[PDB]
Ligand binder design. Structure first.
Ligand SMILES: O[C@@H]1[C@H](O)[C@H](O)CO[C@H]1O
Ligand SMILES: O[C@@H]1[C@H](O)[C@H](O)CO[C@H]1O
Lengths: 140, 140
């Protein structure tokens, strides 16, 4: 297991993929959360280019935090995550948006509000255990 | 540090006190949570006689979960918790209600919906680290 909260310095651009494998720490009846934030600095209070928050079994909210203030969230009731199961998240940086795959299924997208090149850090936290975390760095 | 999620088998009655010392794992801008649940069985999906959930810097909700269904929550905007600080929670079982002290200050109360003798387990979880947990057992 990787430590949670998990923080890794990161850079992103079109073609980058962030892969996360983990499991919720509670049954869905107890409403565990999962949060992935792409930050503009290593500091936890820095701006967030992409905030992804799952309330397992209930909903997902996505937003940005710019100059310290939250912007307009996008709320989804799509819920591909399965109660009591390990999940694999694959986040792709496409030219126009982030695409979130859950267990290989396209499940959410979020249009860029800030260039992905502004990201310097990724944090994964809340009610999960993690077994894998990777940011790909294969493209120019 | 005690492991989080933290679970301890427990019994409560009038005069019992549950003491918890810990710290949030994130700054308040990031909205870390704290949850304390008094359960009717050791199973995490069991009923909850007293659910106490803090969204640090924002609000507190209290409720019960009976026969698998959440009842009517009580919402408070009282926020004695301080950003970036260790806190001490003291929960007293009074004849009529639970009284929650935060850093020695009376901060929330919740009238009994189910007898406290129905409790068999206490769970402390979400975005905190813990250094102390105690249930007192000094009274008849
Ligand atoms: O998760 C964030 C925070 O709760 C913020 O306070 C409002 O926007 C939501 O998307
Ligand atoms: O925290 C609980 C859960 O969110 C439930 O779904 C509704 O009641 C709230 O108090």
């Amino acid at each position: 297991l990787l430590p949670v909260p998990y923080t890794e310095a990161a850079s992103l651009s079109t073609g980058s993929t962030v892969t996360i494998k983990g499991r919720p720490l509670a049954c869905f009846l107890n409403e565990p959360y999962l949060q992935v934030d792409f930050h503009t600095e290593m500091k936890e209070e820095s701006d967030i280019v992409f905030h992804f928050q799952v309330c397992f079994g209930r909903r997902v909210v996505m937003n940005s935090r710019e100059y310290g203030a939250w912007k307009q969230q996008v709320e989804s009731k799509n819920m591909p995550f399965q109660d009591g199961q390990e999940f694999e998240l694959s986040i792709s940086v496409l030219p126009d948006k982030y695409q979130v795959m859950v267990n290989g299924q396209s499940s959410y997208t979020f249009d860029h509000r800030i260039k992905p090149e502004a990201v310097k850090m990724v944090q994964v936290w809340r009610d999960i255990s993690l077994t894998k975390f990777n940011v790909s760095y294969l493209k120019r």
